[PDB]
Write a protein that binds this ligand. Structure first.
Ligand code: ADP
Ligand code: ADP
Ligand code: ADP
Ligand code: MG
Ligand code: MG
Ligand code: MG
Lengths: 523, 535, 49, 31, 523
């Protein structure tokens, strides 16, 4: 195919530069986000060449790979791998990128050993099957005795926020992340926790609101605070209805009848508001816009009117007040109203927001992130999003494993025990699978500046004879017990790091020909 | 406005003023520091015995791996006039002393980095420059406290070998750290005039040939030239050579003017044949009457004179260079004779084993002079595995030949490894309080910049700079200050007197003097008048 | 090192001398049209007015 | 003994000085 | 220096792309000539873009690297390293290139282990000192009992020619290489063995001439063969002498005196030839050109005249006949003449060459290389030059070591035995030195198509307990004894492979900054 090429502007390579470009392009992705892994790793700042560059600092490996725009074909497999890891569990996107790159780096070492690439695939399938049994047998469940499960949930949020910008804020941001999912008391919808980013103040000034915050302040001549009110929301049109009959006009003979029709239009718009206040309410939230004619009617009756909050803002108010959407007002005995105590307006960062203090059945939260710059607020929002998504799945799957390098040495030990019970064809591929699992505590140990050649060697000697909870202590720089220090991760997060990296390395290693087509508008 | 007046007339002062660049501002001093710190940060990693080398590529594509600070800055294409003064600073250290060409650039970049924070406090740049002269004067007088050597050039060569090991310890000759250090000691003492304390480097020939290894580098007492025996059946080994050095070509004597000799009859043409036949028999017999058995000639040989050498058993070389035969007459004790008629037994040279040595498969056949008699000229034959390790060893051993020359000029030594820089930094800090009137901040910036050189040795050795320097500096205040520095493998204790890290006094005396004066010429400048594009 | 703005920066007494010549460029125009001995000017446009 | 040696042969030791020198130009511009 | 760059067209890099471009450029040189190492390795064909491309196939690693013209700065150190290896010992230029590249490949593995590069230099200096004692203690000397030394010389030429184009010609070309150096009986000048390449015939038709061959055939009217002749050579001018008096004219008054001068010129040219034939000779060799006036004088006296052989042609005739150059003819009792039996002319490839059959004191040879193409003759000349240079130094240094991977496992065993008696800072660098020494039998084993993962493992298990002569058997594909099979190499060849690769890898590993200047006429 290179000799006597039958292509126009397209090129290809077979078994010489195919695996060469696949191993170079995938290691350079993994070596890029290598410095961001661990609780002592640095962060990246992403910039463009211009034309609203919109600089966005991120430490999470999914947000780095989704914005760099790699031109390598085999590197897009690892870029899409970190996107699925953020969409499923929301954590380990950096850990699954280095692990999939360390598998292909050990596969580059098997180039000169003349090992068949299908032997490495069949050797890694038996290695990944033994690695699933190491995490499944070491998972710690939590059913009853809930005072130890809430302590276990703070160890999950303490491990996730340690590898982010919120380093010296674990005394505050752990309570902001555990109690946010604990106030859901149900499914992890991940949209009732509305994060509001406001400039001014430090990250210690951020807090979790006991009620709910909103924008689009209360009318013009309406009351600003009503105590012991009944909140009724809506999703209906207020004025300029044009009610659902396309092709309907007002064909009259004189202009005196147009004055009678427009008075009949305002009488039906007034009668719609009169059906709303028969419920006995004091606040009104409409998803659509409220014009001036129903605004005067709510202001004359002493009723609030919040106009055009959000499409998903009426869903959070329905989960924090315990009511319903109620888009049709014709049955006051079948419409459930919300409950609150204070609807006072608070000022956060020279902006008046509507505080719904003292609400009943409040299965929704509002995190008020305050930072020094907008770059910190964009990073702390993604750092909190990577912490709330794991706790939303830890309450659904209570199985937890010991992180901090302890889980990877347990997975590498089960592969090494079965590497000695195999013939020599697939045993060399299983030894490279166990060395790549030991690189994940090696990257964490070397990012702090510790002796990674000795600490991982002490972890391999500890896990070889007992010590199932022995891991890497990044606080002092030694080997400690992970059950005492409280460094644990979720089972489903660590399983998706192991499983998705083994499936993505299976695709790139099986590629022997990269036939790229002719691009458009590139000359 | 620029290029226009307020009355509408064009305002042109100098030619092509639109394509000019002029900066007075407050960033004109800031642009000089940021251009000089990047040169000092480059040379910081190549300091000490753990200093990593640099790969230099010429314009023709030739690659030379250099570690000495003189050749690194000289082979750059830096078109920056502030960094060009750092090239001439490392060149001035090589021309005068020749050991601290790397350390004089890191020290000059350290004085400018400490002057950057002093510039933001409102201090005048000449006031910092006047404060550095009062601070460098303390470093000169404190460096002359502990200094002694017992070199007698007879049997006490042990301070001379350990001085050359400090210079050769930072280069790539650490495999020959004991062998090649003794070569540079004996090469200087055999050619130096101890009555005048003058060393001539023209008597020390440094030749190099690829092949062998670094351990095959020997000190040949004599000369090494390319032997060009015109006869292939010439004997390739002379046991006792009476060398007849001459500067006349083996030919009939041709004058320097236009002759146009006229031949009229056939008796004059037969006289032409007998004139040249007796001339080649006269130039051969006048060498054999002196008892000579070896001839050196600057110019070429005739074919008729080549066979007369073999009949009379007189080996001779052909087409030797200008200063090459000047080294033969000193190594053999002979005299260079212009003609053939002035040859005598007193103008002959004496030599022992005169032979040519073929190196592998090549056809060079260099001269090896084993035995001699009170020669004042030696030749170092550097061998290696490639031309990168030989041209560096020519630059590494030349720094070892210079530190022995500095000991004959001044027999006072100091202790390196950062021990002299920490001790000099304490002398400026003690005299900064006597008195802290105006130049208190300028002297403390000098003492903080003198600590950059020992803390660069701690950075290249894998240690911590502020952890190791605080331990060494505190031990010199609690007791009397010893030769206390650092090392790479650290040799146990940190005593430089026990580790035999010996440097010359005038080497470090010119490191502080040249870096202070180069800082004064780059601090006392407030404008740049560089042009724009090339054309 | 320096400011990475894509425009042009001039500090010191350069702008302090340019603003005076900018004000004197306007004053030297209208100095010939002051008082009873002042004289009018001509303002010709590109279109010919 | 030296109690270890941590060789750091990587990029961001030089980019860290680039963020320092750029922020010093902003503070000296509005000084 | 990248930040606020003060260079015009020059670029540089420090500790990030300096060691990156040095490790890429040096491995790609070693991986290029990796396929040419061993007795079963293939060859390369070197071609240019045009303008008298002059294709030259070579298997020797020095001739490949000296013609490619690498643009990488660190790759030129390994190119110049193989140039000295060809000029000193004439063999191992491919072995010193792969060994210097495998050291830097193991040094690239120490990048992620955070090992200081000066520790690797200090670790390799102790490893090279342990490897010198392994070759010195295993060297086999040969003094007397010359029937075992001539058998040992055939094992040296059989090992060198096995890795070249002369594969199935070891029954003939070994005798052409051993007997060529054996007829020197003195110093290895490496120029008395004049190799003549003629097209036509196979490589089995090549032979070593018992006498000497020459060109520039014998005159016009001179005899072509003289039995039992006395050969006298010369290096003097025959006609148009203009004898050594610059600025001498013939200023006469009449044209009759010009006829007397030109008759006196031809009488002195006749008297010069009359001084030559007083020695009683039958053949004449002049380095300069012989014109028509002395050519008639040799033809009338029945004397041969070989005009303008070569500058080095009279040197080989002086070593094969036992005479002297004799550029001056005035003492017939002090001029030693040559000796021969037949000066008949032979025809090799439709070209008449002067055969000096039956010469006495013949310390010079003539190899008549005959091949199918010119590409085979250019390869067989360099293959014979790589075999004659080792035998010219084996007679000077009779120490020989067991090759075929046996010498590399002896060197790797001495490093590994002293790597366990060292602290962990330098012991990791010594283990990487021993792994690169085991790569040299791994390249030889994998080029044939054998299982290189098991044969080097069988060599390491054999050398760990005895078996100092155990090596790789490339004939059947197993492990055999090198003293029985007769696969030996010279000690000075194997020492220069170890020593020059350790010095060249020391230079490139100590480079932290590559500052290349702006080139000329490149835009
Ligand atoms: N306190 C701690 N002790 C030890 N290891 C920790 C600690 N906190 C975090 N880690 C480690 O740091 C790593 C951070 O990975 P991360 O970049 O969050 O992966 P992802 O990008 O997939 O979320 C985890 O694998 C974890 O093992
Ligand atoms: N054994 C040692 N222990 C500690 N320091 C040493 C040792 N050997 C050399 N040094 C230091 O290394 C430095 C090398 O300086 P160098 O680059 O040779 O200066 P220059 O460029 O002027 O020749 C010296 O200043 C010396 O203090
Ligand atoms: N008969 C044989 N058995 C085993 N090994 C052999 C045999 N012949 C040659 N070799 C190996 O092949 C290699 C060829 O190396 P070569 O390319 O000649 O090096 P260089 O280019 O330096 O001369 C040698 O190192 C030798 O060990
Ligand atoms: Mg995480
Ligand atoms: Mg030095
Ligand atoms: Mg060979």
């Amino acid at each position: 195919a290179p000799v006597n090429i039958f292509k126009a502007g397209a090129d290809e390579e077979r078994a010489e530069t195919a695996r060469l470009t696949s191993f170079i392009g995938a290691i350079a992705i993994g070596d890029l986000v290598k410095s961001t892994l661990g609780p002592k790793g640095m962060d990246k700042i992403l910039l463009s060449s211009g034309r609203d560059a919109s600089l966005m600092v991120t430490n999470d490996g999914a947000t780095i790979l989704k914005n760099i725009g790699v031109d390598n074909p085999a590197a897009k497999v690892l870029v899409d791998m970190s996107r699925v890891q953020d969409d499923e569990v929301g954590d380990g996107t950096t850990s699954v990128t280095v692990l999939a790159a360390e598998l292909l780096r050990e596969a580059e070492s098997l180039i000169a050993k003349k090992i068949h690439p299908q032997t490495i695939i069949a050797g890694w399938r038996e290695a990944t099957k033994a690695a699933r049994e190491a995490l499944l047998s070491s998972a710690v469940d939590h059913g009853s005795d809930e005072v130890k499960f809430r302590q276990d949930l703070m160890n999950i949020a303490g491990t996730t926020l340690s590898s982010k910008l919120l380093t010296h804020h674990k005394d505050h941001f752990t309570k902001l992340a555990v109690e946010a999912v604990l106030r859901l008391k149900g499914s992890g919808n991940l949209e009732a926790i509305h994060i509001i980013k406001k400039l001014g103040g430090s990250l210690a000034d951020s807090y979790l609101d006991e009620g709910f915050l909103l924008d689009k302040k209360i009318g013009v001549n309406q009351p600003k605070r009503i105590e012991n009110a009944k909140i009724l929301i809506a999703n209906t049109g207020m004025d300029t209805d044009k009610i659902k009959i396309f092709g309907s006009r007002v064909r009259v003979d004189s202009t005196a009848k147009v004055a009678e029709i427009e008075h009949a239009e305002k009488e039906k718009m007034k009668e719609k508001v009169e059906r709303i206040l028969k419920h006995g309410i004091n606040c009104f939230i409409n998803r659509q816009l409220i014009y001036n004619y129903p605004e005067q009617l709510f202001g004359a009756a002493g009723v609030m009117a919040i106009e055009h909050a959000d499409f998903a803002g009426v869903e959070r108010l329905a989960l924090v007040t315990g009511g319903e959407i109620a888009s049709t007002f014709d049955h006051p005995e079948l419409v459930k109203l919300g409950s609150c105590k204070l609807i006072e307006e608070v000022m956060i960062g020279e902006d008046k927001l509507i505080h719904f203090s003292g609400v009943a059945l409040g299965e929704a939260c509002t995190i008020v992130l305050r930072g020094a710059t907008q770059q910190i607020l964009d990073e702390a929002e993604r750092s909190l999003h990577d912490a709330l998504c794991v706790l939303a799945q830890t309450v659904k799957d209570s199985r937890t494993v010991y992180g901090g390098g302890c889980s990877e040495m347990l997975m590498a030990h089960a592969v090494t025990q079965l590497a000695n019970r195999t013939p020599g064809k697939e045993a060399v591929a299983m030894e490279s699978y166990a060395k790549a699992l030991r690189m994940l505590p090696t990257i964490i140990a070397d990012n702090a500046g510790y002796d990674s050649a000795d600490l991982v060697a002490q972890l391999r000697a500890a896990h070889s004879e007992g010590n199932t909870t022995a891991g890497l202590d990044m606080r002092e720089g030694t080997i400690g017990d992970m059950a005492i220090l409280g460094i644990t991760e979720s089972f489903q997060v660590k399983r998706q790091v192991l499983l998705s990296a083994a499936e993505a390395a299976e695709v790139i290693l099986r590629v022997d020909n990269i036939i790229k087509a002719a691009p458009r508008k590139r000359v | 406005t620029l290029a226009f007046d307020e009355y509408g007339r064009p305002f042109l002062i100098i030619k092509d003023q639109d394509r000019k660049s002029r900066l007075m501002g407050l960033e004109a001093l800031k642009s000089h520091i940021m251009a000089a710190k990047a040169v000092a940060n480059t040379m910081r990693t190549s300091l000490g015995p753990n200093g990593l080398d640099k790969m230099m590529v010429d314009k023709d594509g030739d690659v030379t791996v250099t570690n000495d600070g003189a050749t690194i800055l000289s082979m750059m294409d830096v078109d920056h006039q502030i960094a060009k003064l750092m090239v001439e600073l490392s060149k001035s250290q090589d021309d005068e002393i020749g050991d601290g060409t790397t350390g004089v650039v890191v020290l000059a970049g350290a004085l400018l980095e400490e002057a950057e924070q002093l510039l933001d406090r409102g201090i005048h740049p000449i006031r910092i420059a006047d404060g550095y002269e009062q601070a460098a004067r303390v470093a000169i007088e404190h460096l002359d406290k502990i200094s002694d050597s017992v070199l007698v050039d007879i049997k006490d060569t042990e301070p001379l070998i350990q001085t050359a090991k400090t210079t050769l310890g930072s280069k790539v000759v650490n495999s020959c750290h004991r062998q090649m250090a003794e070569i540079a000691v004996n090469a200087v003492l055999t050619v130096a005039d101890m009555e005048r304390r003058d060393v001539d480097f023209e008597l020390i020939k440094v030749e190099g040939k690829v092949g062998g290894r670094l351990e095959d580098t020997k000190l040949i007492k004599g000369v090494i030239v390319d032997k060009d025996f015109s006869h292939p059946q010439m004997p390739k080994k002379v046991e006792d050579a009476k060398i007849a050095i001459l500067t006349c070509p083996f030919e009939p004597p041709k004058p320097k003017t236009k002759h146009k000799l006229d031949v009229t009859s056939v008796e004059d043409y037969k006289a032409l044949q007998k004139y040249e036949k007796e001339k080649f028999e006269e130039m051969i017999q006048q060498i054999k009457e002196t008892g000579a058995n070896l001839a050196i000639c600057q110019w070429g040989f005739d074919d008729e004179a080549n066979h007369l050498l073999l009949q009379n058993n007189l080996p001779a070389v052909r087409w030797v260079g200008g200063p090459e035969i000047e080294l033969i007459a000193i190594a053999t004790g002979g005299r260079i004779v212009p003609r053939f008629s002035e040859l005598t037994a007193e103008k002959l040279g004496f030599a022992g084993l005169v032979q040519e040595i073929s190196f592998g498969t090549t056809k060079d056949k260099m001269l090896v002079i084993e035995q001699c008699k009170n020669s004042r000229a030696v030749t170092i034959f550097i061998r290696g595995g490639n031309k990168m390790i030989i041209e560096e060893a020519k630059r590494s051993l030349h720094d070892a030949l210079c530190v022995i020359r500095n000991l004959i000029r001044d027999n006072r030594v100091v202790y390196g490894g950062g021990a002299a820089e920490i001790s000099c930094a304490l002398a400026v800090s003690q005299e900064a309080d006597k008195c802290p009137t105006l130049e208190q901040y300028a002297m403390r910036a000098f003492a903080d910049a003198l600590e950059v050189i020992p803390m660069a040795l701690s950075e290249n050795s894998g240690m911590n700079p502020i952890q190791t320097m605080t331990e060494v500096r505190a031990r010199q205040v609690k007791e009397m200050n010893p030769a206390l520095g650092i090392d790479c493998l650290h040799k146990g204790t940190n005593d430089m007197k026990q580790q035999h890290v010996i440097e010359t006094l005038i080497g470090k005396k010119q490191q502080i003097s040249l870096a202070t004066q180069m800082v004064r010429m780059i601090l006392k400048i407030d404008d740049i008048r560089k042009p724009g594009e090339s054309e | 090192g320096p400011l990475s703005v894509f425009g042009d920066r001039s500090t010191g007494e350069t702008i302090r001398s340019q603003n005076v010549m900018a004000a004197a460029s306007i004053a030297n125009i209208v100095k010939s049209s002051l008082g009873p001995v002042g004289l009018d000017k001509m303002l010709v446009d590109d279109i010919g007015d | 003994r030296g109690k270890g040696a941590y060789q750091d042969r990587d990029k961001p030791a030089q980019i860290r000085f680039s963020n320092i020198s750029a922020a010093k130009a902003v503070a000296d511009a509005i000084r």
